[PDB]
Design an enzyme around this catalytic site. Structure first.
Site, PDB file in Angstrom:
ATOM      1  N   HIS A   1      -0.549 -11.198  -5.019  1.00  0.00           N
ATOM      2  CA  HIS A   1       0.890 -10.865  -4.887  1.00  0.00           C
ATOM      3  C   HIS A   1       1.760 -12.004  -5.452  1.00  0.00           C
ATOM      4  O   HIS A   1       2.747 -11.669  -6.082  1.00  0.00           O
ATOM      5  CB  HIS A   1       1.242 -10.392  -3.471  1.00  0.00           C
ATOM      6  CG  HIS A   1       1.115 -11.428  -2.420  1.00  0.00           C
ATOM      7  ND1 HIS A   1       2.203 -12.158  -1.994  1.00  0.00           N
ATOM      8  CD2 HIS A   1       0.051 -11.826  -1.679  1.00  0.00           C
ATOM      9  CE1 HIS A   1       1.802 -12.990  -1.055  1.00  0.00           C
ATOM     10  NE2 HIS A   1       0.488 -12.802  -0.828  1.00  0.00           N
TER      11      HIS A   1
ATOM     12  N   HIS B   1      -9.186  -1.751  -5.056  1.00  0.00           N
ATOM     13  CA  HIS B   1      -8.119  -2.094  -4.092  1.00  0.00           C
ATOM     14  C   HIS B   1      -7.147  -3.087  -4.770  1.00  0.00           C
ATOM     15  O   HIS B   1      -5.935  -2.942  -4.627  1.00  0.00           O
ATOM     16  CB  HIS B   1      -8.681  -2.588  -2.764  1.00  0.00           C
ATOM     17  CG  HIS B   1      -7.546  -2.749  -1.816  1.00  0.00           C
ATOM     18  ND1 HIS B   1      -6.862  -1.638  -1.322  1.00  0.00           N
ATOM     19  CD2 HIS B   1      -6.874  -3.841  -1.406  1.00  0.00           C
ATOM     20  CE1 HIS B   1      -5.843  -2.040  -0.601  1.00  0.00           C
ATOM     21  NE2 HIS B   1      -5.833  -3.390  -0.616  1.00  0.00           N
TER      22      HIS B   1
ATOM     23  N   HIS C   1       0.863  -1.232   0.000  1.00  0.00           N
ATOM     24  CA  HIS C   1       0.000   0.000   0.000  1.00  0.00           C
ATOM     25  C   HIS C   1       0.873   1.247   0.000  1.00  0.00           C
ATOM     26  O   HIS C   1       0.591   2.178  -0.773  1.00  0.00           O
ATOM     27  CB  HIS C   1      -0.957   0.058   1.176  1.00  0.00           C
ATOM     28  CG  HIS C   1      -1.883  -1.098   1.182  1.00  0.00           C
ATOM     29  ND1 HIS C   1      -2.709  -1.390   2.245  1.00  0.00           N
ATOM     30  CD2 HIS C   1      -2.102  -2.030   0.238  1.00  0.00           C
ATOM     31  CE1 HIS C   1      -3.402  -2.472   1.936  1.00  0.00           C
ATOM     32  NE2 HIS C   1      -2.987  -2.920   0.733  1.00  0.00           N
TER      33      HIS C   1
ATOM     34  N   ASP D   1      -3.127  -2.584  -5.034  1.00  0.00           N
ATOM     35  CA  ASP D   1      -2.121  -3.600  -4.628  1.00  0.00           C
ATOM     36  C   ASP D   1      -1.206  -3.899  -5.834  1.00  0.00           C
ATOM     37  O   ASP D   1       0.014  -3.971  -5.625  1.00  0.00           O
ATOM     38  CB  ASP D   1      -2.716  -4.920  -4.137  1.00  0.00           C
ATOM     39  CG  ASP D   1      -3.489  -5.048  -2.827  1.00  0.00           C
ATOM     40  OD1 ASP D   1      -3.294  -4.301  -1.795  1.00  0.00           O
ATOM     41  OD2 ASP D   1      -4.262  -5.933  -2.824  1.00  0.00           O
TER      42      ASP D   1
HETATM   43  C1  LIG Z   1     -11.108  -4.884  16.350  1.00  0.00           C
HETATM   44  O1  LIG Z   1     -11.050  -6.144  15.655  1.00  0.00           O
HETATM   45  C2  LIG Z   1     -12.132  -7.080  15.839  1.00  0.00           C
HETATM   46  C3  LIG Z   1     -12.720  -7.650  14.537  1.00  0.00           C
HETATM   47  O2  LIG Z   1     -13.860  -6.854  14.257  1.00  0.00           O
HETATM   48  C4  LIG Z   1     -11.840  -7.687  13.327  1.00  0.00           C
HETATM   49  C5  LIG Z   1     -12.139  -6.995  12.122  1.00  0.00           C
HETATM   50  C6  LIG Z   1     -11.287  -7.077  11.012  1.00  0.00           C
HETATM   51  C7  LIG Z   1     -10.108  -7.820  11.041  1.00  0.00           C
HETATM   52  C8  LIG Z   1      -9.347  -7.894   9.951  1.00  0.00           C
HETATM   53  C9  LIG Z   1      -8.742  -8.077   8.924  1.00  0.00           C
HETATM   54  C10 LIG Z   1      -8.225  -8.439   7.758  1.00  0.00           C
HETATM   55  C11 LIG Z   1      -7.442  -9.583   7.641  1.00  0.00           C
HETATM   56  C12 LIG Z   1      -6.940  -9.997   6.401  1.00  0.00           C
HETATM   57  C13 LIG Z   1      -7.222  -9.323   5.202  1.00  0.00           C
HETATM   58  C14 LIG Z   1      -6.726  -9.825   3.848  1.00  0.00           C
HETATM   59  O3  LIG Z   1      -5.756 -10.536   3.721  1.00  0.00           O
HETATM   60  N1  LIG Z   1      -7.416  -9.569   2.735  1.00  0.00           N
HETATM   61  C15 LIG Z   1      -7.141 -10.158   1.444  1.00  0.00           C
HETATM   62  C16 LIG Z   1      -8.179  -9.605   0.452  1.00  0.00           C
HETATM   63  C17 LIG Z   1      -7.890  -8.142   0.103  1.00  0.00           C
HETATM   64  C18 LIG Z   1      -6.970  -8.197  -1.076  1.00  0.00           C
HETATM   65  N2  LIG Z   1      -5.598  -8.261  -0.667  1.00  0.00           N
HETATM   66  C19 LIG Z   1      -4.960  -7.241  -0.120  1.00  0.00           C
HETATM   67  O4  LIG Z   1      -5.480  -6.148   0.203  1.00  0.00           O
HETATM   68  C20 LIG Z   1      -3.504  -7.533   0.182  1.00  0.00           C
HETATM   69  C21 LIG Z   1      -3.397  -8.347   1.440  1.00  0.00           C
HETATM   70  C22 LIG Z   1      -3.464  -7.363   2.567  1.00  0.00           C
HETATM   71  F1  LIG Z   1      -4.817  -7.319   2.844  1.00  0.00           F
HETATM   72  C23 LIG Z   1      -2.879  -6.067   1.981  1.00  0.00           C
HETATM   73  N3  LIG Z   1      -2.770  -6.327   0.523  1.00  0.00           N
HETATM   74  C24 LIG Z   1      -7.291  -9.484  -1.800  1.00  0.00           C
HETATM   75  N4  LIG Z   1      -8.033 -10.282  -0.836  1.00  0.00           N
HETATM   76  C25 LIG Z   1      -8.616 -11.454  -1.119  1.00  0.00           C
HETATM   77  O5  LIG Z   1      -8.620 -11.838  -2.266  1.00  0.00           O
HETATM   78  C26 LIG Z   1      -9.230 -12.277  -0.025  1.00  0.00           C
HETATM   79  C27 LIG Z   1     -10.461 -13.087  -0.397  1.00  0.00           C
HETATM   80  C28 LIG Z   1      -9.150 -13.810  -0.138  1.00  0.00           C
HETATM   81  C29 LIG Z   1      -8.012  -8.186   5.322  1.00  0.00           C
HETATM   82  C30 LIG Z   1      -8.497  -7.760   6.567  1.00  0.00           C
HETATM   83  C31 LIG Z   1      -9.809  -8.501  12.248  1.00  0.00           C
HETATM   84  C32 LIG Z   1     -10.664  -8.442  13.358  1.00  0.00           C
HETATM   85 ZN   LIG Z   2      -4.092  -4.468  -0.271  1.00  0.00          ZN
END
Ligand SMILES: COC[C@@H](O)c1ccc(C#Cc2ccc(C(=O)NC[C@H]3C[C@@H](NC(=O)[C@@H]4C[C@H](F)CN4)CN3C(=O)C3CC3)cc2)cc1
Ligand SMILES: [Zn+2]
Length: 296
Positions: free
Chosen positions: A261, A234, A78, A238
């Site tokens: 990625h 998004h 990001h 990425d």
């Molecule tokens: C207070 O907490 C309490 C509670 O409510 C709470 C709420 C929220 C969370 C959280 C969180 C959280 C954890 C992991 C990810 C993630 O890896 N996303 C992957 C997505 C986004 C994109 N990939 C990307 O964006 C890549 C991977 C990274 F995301 C950055 N770049 C591609 N992609 C997919 O294709 C997915 C479908 C397979 C995102 C958010 C935890 C606890």
């Molecule tokens: Zn991302």
């Protein structure tokens, strides 16, 4: 001529690592001509520095990771997207910990902190990688392609069988603002995935404040989406971060089909190896160049 850019001023930021849940102090510093982007773990003695280059990318885990021995910087994509979107060539990124802060889950806070500092043109020609030949990588139903294109464009398609899920977008960045149309697009997570990751001591910094949280049916975030197509925007964000590991701005088109990625990195490696498919070019005249930058 189109000139290399660095920061005008140092930028300081605080946040939480998405996966680590660790408080992290971030400093972006100006850097000399032909430095590129260099990450720096300043919590270590000796300080460990990893150039943000495809050759330093680690085991393609939950996010883009830079490694050097048993030292890593997690989730660089990001920040590198923000630096790519603004055309920053040279910068030191200092981190107090192993992961880049997630901020709001988008590139928006980084682009704002950087454009608050301003940019400095430097006395050296900016070097571009121009795509000369189509380079395609596939694995299963995923595909990532470079196409020759007189400019810079990113097309993306995702295909989730999910009630919440426009799953396609194309942005030509010479005619459309990265800042306005892409930079604010947030990372997203399905509740079933987040519950699993949490069980495995991952996503420890995740919250509605830094991710679109999706259950079976709907976005749980009270204030909803920033864009109707936030998810595929998004993906584009990425991809722009991962492309910047080439270490030079691109003249060409990127097309992703359910890419991520791991395949993005397979594409960079294949492009770099196939020296018939690209050349390094400079522009003695910005007015005739296929890309343009904002005033610094
Ligand atoms: C207070 O907490 C309490 C509670 O409510 C709470 C709420 C929220 C969370 C959280 C969180 C959280 C954890 C992991 C990810 C993630 O890896 N996303 C992957 C997505 C986004 C994109 N990939 C990307 O964006 C890549 C991977 C990274 F995301 C950055 N770049 C591609 N992609 C997919 O294709 C997915 C479908 C397979 C995102 C958010 C935890 C606890
Ligand atoms: Zn991302």
């Amino acid at each position: 001529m189109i000139k290399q850019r660095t920061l005008k001023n140092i930028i300081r930021a605080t946040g939480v690592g998405l996966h680590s849940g660790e408080k992290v102090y971030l400093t972006l510093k100006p850097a000399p001509v032909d430095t590129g982007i260099v990450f720096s773990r300043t919590d270590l003695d000796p300080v460990v520095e990893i150039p943000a280059r495809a050759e330093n990318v680690g085991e393609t885990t939950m996010s883009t990771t830079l490694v050097k021995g048993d030292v890593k910087v997690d989730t660089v994509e990001h920040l590198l997207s923000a630096m790519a979107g603004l055309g920053i060539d040279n910068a030191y990124v200092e981190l107090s910990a192993s992961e880049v802060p997630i901020m709001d889950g988008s590139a928006g806070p980084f682009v704002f902190l950087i454009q608050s500092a301003g940019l400095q043109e430097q006395e050296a020609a900016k070097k571009f990688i121009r795509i000369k030949r189509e380079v395609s990588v596939e694995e299963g139903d995923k595909r990532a392609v470079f196409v020759p294109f007189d400019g810079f464009k990113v097309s993306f398609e995702i295909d989730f069988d999910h009630p919440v899920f426009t799953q396609q977008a194309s942005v030509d960045f010479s005619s459309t603002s990265f800042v306005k149309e892409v930079s604010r697009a947030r990372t997203f997570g399905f509740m079933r995935d987040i519950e699993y990751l949490r069980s495995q001591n991952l996503a420890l910094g995740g919250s509605v404040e830094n991710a679109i949280v999706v259950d079976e049916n709907r976005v749980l975030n009270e204030d909803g989406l920033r864009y109707e197509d936030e998810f595929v925007k998004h993906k584009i964000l990425d991809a722009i971060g991962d492309l910047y590991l080439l270490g030079n701005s691109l003249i060409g088109e990127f097309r992703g089909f359910k890419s991520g990625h791991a395949l993005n990195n397979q594409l960079l490696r294949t492009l770099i190896a196939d020296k018939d498919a690209w050349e390094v070019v400079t522009f003695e005249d910005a007015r005739t160049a296929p890309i343009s930058y904002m005033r610094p």
